[PDB]
Amino acid sequence: ADQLTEEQIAEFKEAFSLFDKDGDGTITTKELGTVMRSLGQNPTEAELQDMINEVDADGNGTIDFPEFLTMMARKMKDTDSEEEIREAFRVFDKDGNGYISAAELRHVMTNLGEKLTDEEVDEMIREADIDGDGQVNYEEFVQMMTAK
Template sequence: MDKLRQYERVFKQFDENGDGKISAWELQQCVEAMGEELSAADAAATVTAMDADGDGMVGFDDFVRFVEGGKEEEKENDLKEAFKMYEMEESGCITPRSLKMMLSRLGESTSIDECEVMIARFDLDGDGVLTFDEFKVMML
């Protein structure tokens, strides 16, 4: 079986509703079905990082590009784009408030307290916000 067919088979496992796109919810469900944990926020951030066309979903082309690894520079640029979506007013960091706003745009209802807990998991310097470098660590 060639690589592309293998990718299609795996992609279809993630694409639960068969619409040709992987949503954050579908990613979360598939990861959990494999016995791992993935929070809604982490799933949303992963989809955002993989989403090249900005539609909030992972298409097959996005999936193949991710699986094949692409160039490091391309990954860095994708992460920067995802980071910009979560930060507010070009502050250079993701705050609990900006995370809450982005998650609500993605259909996730979270409190500021929940967002603080999510950020604390990857807040390496303990300042209560995520810088790009901390975001990058979270995504890798």
């Protein structure tokens, strides 16, 4: 899933509060780039003025956390975590066949540096009939690492 993890929501909530000097849980458009830049993102000025024209639909010129989360979810799209795991399994599809040996699959999940425990993968392997044949595609194992 591409849902915001409780952490990503907290990270943004902290970077957002960083400019909530009104104790109202909101920030001004003048600090929006600063908030976004606080997370290490550097959108151009036009990119910022473009999202403002839409967010500035109330005619007030301010951003609240909820709407701020609507911006983060619109950016963490084209860069899903899925494209990262599939691109890793791609690094493992040296034969461009779409299939690798479970070993390479288990290796793709460990080399990625994911905090997955060998036990969690053992369960993901139960429904992924990784036997009966010997090789398995990852598209199914990719959606499993994202969120059952």
